[PDB]
Subunit: 258 residues, 5 copies
């Protein structure tokens, strides 16, 4: 792909705007945005998480206006987590911080992640415990060995399906993703406070050091996200992951390629 | 069609004010506080009383009567009364035997916006089965999808003491004519960190050099400043809020 | 006043250097820099703190060389003096755990300073409007429930030492055009003090038009609060601990009409 | 070396891309990336850690295209920790946060370190306790004295072997390392949260204040890392170090020297 | 003195490189870098710390090449705490974090300080408790009064001797020190985590707003430091300060003065 000039004229720019909903596991008809309560295996080899207990990566493939060689080039992103204030509900059968106190808020381990590319996000598998038995309906690292706990280059995938790729098994592959820009933060620890900023005044530029943004193959834009905000603690002490949706607004321009 | 800025004597004005918090005000002595928080016995029976729910604050400020429109260019803002949180002697729960009272701390939301029309809101519910109380304006026809995103839940922040903080956020798909800024810091032991200074200015211009344009010569200011919770001797906890200062500089802009 | 040109020449600059001591309550002859130990009221309505339990704003009015020309404050260097004293964890403190060192000063802090050409202007805000503030302090009068969020009756000048309780008053953002102020409240009973010292950091006091505070009557006003946190005694009782603040201000002569 | 001009043209640049795996101790065939459970000596004089309980520095010597005077000059680095999301496995034989709660995540003391150089990283030994008996198979400060607890200039070494130099005994020698760029952060304390950021948009420039990067002696590039993320607590309360792999991508150019 | 031009030519620059060891109290022949265990007086009045329980400021006076009017002007500083990874020894007579856990790492109150000057650092005394009895062998504020607890201007000194000036009763005097640059941070609290960064890529410029660095009177450079990293808790629960050495590299140039 030899990248040539940007087209100008009213015809030459478009914008994509949407929200990606979280895929936390949704253990029943009332619990969209939550996982199943977390249970702990008695040994590493008996770790066998249920599908509804595992947060997964969210992905949307967004069709763009048909171009054909011109390709749509992603230039800027505005993004934010939607519903941050819902975490102020400390009255809905939570565990009291102390006698007569309010409910404990969502807190603990979080992962906030987003990416914009001209093709599916490329993944590398890394396992906390290579003996974990991942459940039917998920897509997970296969032929796992003990080396999979640090780096096994067999574990390559594309984030090409929703509700499928568990967050804990997969990360962006830094050896690939030439045509994607990704950003993520893991903040670990059972008592970590969510710190969630919102504003409509912040923009991320998606251009690389050569002035080129992701180029959308087949006129498809790929957006991916994870927003595990922490865990909700019920009155009983049981804990569930809670996630939130992520807003994306991407500005694209037409670029000629050879 | 946004054209040139007017210059000269007549061409600039300034709005200054304070927005008071709306934390619930459970009796005649408790302005700035919510009712003590109670916890539902089950998830599906969540039913908070009105005076236990902090709400968004809003003020519509009339501007000098003027096509010209007032354009909001700069903002200075801060929380007013930060030091009041040093009152650790007013029947609080002692940190330990013979200790001082626990200060206000825990989950906070600090938010402000400036716009030329009402802030546009999107509803998101922690629990879609929460029964919100009479006197509040809340997401209607809630479904389980309301827990992550239900696009039916659209509203305007057009009334005080009405829109609960926990149900609503700025709608990022709208608000083209508003600039908003907010931070949620969650967790029961989070410390308030509150900065004051008269030397900091936020510029409200967009990337094209245009600020919010004030329709009908009105400026919209919105805020939430839930600072955390106060813990009483008994262990019961109430939200505590503070007022927010706004100073906005505006200039006359021609529009076609 | 029209602000005209800065005067130049050897004669045209001056410098003020001083320290402001903290006013934490000083409950006896050995406890300068500390408050009285904190007591908690039995009911919310009966809150009635003693004067020696209430830290106050510090202020100094500094006379400048006699001079229309006015002295214009241009820069500030400032820092908290005696930060290392907080390493004394061996003086009648409460042990962190069995056999452990004493708990250091920690918890709620307020660090504040201002430089102006007239007294700092204050606005009152009350945690609890039914608090009975003690004789010898200057506090918001005619308090109502609105005073818990905003009652514009409560206006004052920081014009006296050992008088204006920190917990009652903040800088009035609707005034103070001729002062620059800066403060941080860090609340919570376990927050760690984080105190930086250096002689290499300068704050510029000029506004967006390039004009600094202009000293009316050739007086410079400096104000400070440095409540570093609470010291916990062996018994568990807790006292506020404050420290002094250094100020160095550079000033220049400015013509006005 | 007198440093002269940079060569230009198609042939004048090369890139190195790889991952360094962590060397945390690997106490059995299922625990790659973990140390042995930590045990505590009764006294300073009886401190005698086993080899599998001691994380070590990772190092790779990467041969570069043969040049001969020209040398490869390292100019930029992209790096990130691989597998950050694996730390969201809070269901695999971990100690519950509280009754009925999720497993505690990896947390506590961490050391994140990386270096890029034109020769081996130079190390200086500093011991917490000079009377520690370091185990067979490790390379550790020899002839330790009480002065070794603060600075004993005898303890000089090169990071020239994997699985050998314990992290707790050695630091980069600030008095040397003119031909290396190193960066590290120790965050100590039993409850500190991991905060791990990932993105493919961040580059570190390796040039010094004269515009000169590490110069690769004998056409070898040396990459070194430690990423001790914290400790994993199992259900019994025992704690093990957990580490992760680090990705490196280094761009190099040819430089003439005299 | 009037500061005139900088000298140029290869003769005109010099460099000082050294390390300053910590002086934490060194309670016996095996505990270099540690204080004595910390004990607590029953009253303010009875506060009487042992010499070996009191960390002190470190100082080195470094002779420079003889000049004579020319003076050496200090222009840049690179500095680093040496041995940060030693704090990963959590297996040496430490108190377990919980049953079967690892040892508690060094944590709690820290003071990290350094200065570079052309004369001795000027100190001002401030006492936590003016009735504290400072021990024989230390140099402390004399004629203390209750005003010494906030500011007593009688308490002036020069940092002109090692193992002498206790950290807790002296600070840099901001009313003096025109010919020194100093930097320090106190982080207080019993559980605060050490956060220690190391790199050889960071330089501090020592020039003031007029482009003039410290001028070395009598061809002597003064380096001062404190690096109290926190406290080590042994198995009994007793606590000792732990310090580390600090590296300095200072670049100087010849300046003419009148
Ligand atoms: C948000 C919610 O629904 N919480 C409820 C949970 C979850 O439904 C399940 O744990 C999901 O797996 O179930 C409980 O029996 C429990 O574990 O204490 C009651 C609790 O009120
Ligand atoms: C600030 C305040 O008023 N605190 C009081 C509260 C609140 O009035 C209610 O909780 C409001 O809902 O009532 C108490 O009975 C309580 O809960 O312990 C006594 C306490 O002193
Ligand atoms: C630093 C100090 O002086 N501590 C003493 C305090 C204070 O003098 C008062 O609390 C001031 O109000 O008084 C005690 O009775 C206490 O409260 O435990 C004894 C303690 O030794
Ligand atoms: K690649
Ligand atoms: K839009
Ligand atoms: K060197």
């Amino acid at each position: 792909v030899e990248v040539l000039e940007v087209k100008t004229g009213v015809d030459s720019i478009t914008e994509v705007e949407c929200f990606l909903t979280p895929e936390m596991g949704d253990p029943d008809e009332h619990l969209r945005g939550f996982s199943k309560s977390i249970s702990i295996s008695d040994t590493f080899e008996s770790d066998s998480p249920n599908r509804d207990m595992l947060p997964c990566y969210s992905v949307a493939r967004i069709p763009l206006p048909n171009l054909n060689i011109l390709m749509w080039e992603a230039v800027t992103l505005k993004t934010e987590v939607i519903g941050v204030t819902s975490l102020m509900n400390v009255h809905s059968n939570g565990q009291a911080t102390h006698d007569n106190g309010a409910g404990k808020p969502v807190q603990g381990t979080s992962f906030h992640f987003f990416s914009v590319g001209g093709e599916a996000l490329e993944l590398q598998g890394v396992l906390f415990n290579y003996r974990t038995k991942y459940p039917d309906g998920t897509i997970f690292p296969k032929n796992a060995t003990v080396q999979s706990q640090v780096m096994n280059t067999e574990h390559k995938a594309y984030l090409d399906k929703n509700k499928a790729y568990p967050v804990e098994c997969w990360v962006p592959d830094p050896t690939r993703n030439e045509n994607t820009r990704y950003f993520g933060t893991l903040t670990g620890g059972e008592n970590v406070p969510p710190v969630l900023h919102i504003t409509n005044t912040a923009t991320t530029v998606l251009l690389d050091e050569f002035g080129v943004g992701p180029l959308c193959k087949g006129d498809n834009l790929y957006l991916s996200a994870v927003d595990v905000c922490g865990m909700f603690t019920n009155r009983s002490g049981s804990q569930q992951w809670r996630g939130l949706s992520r807003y994306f607004k991407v500005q694209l321009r037409k670029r000629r390629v050879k």
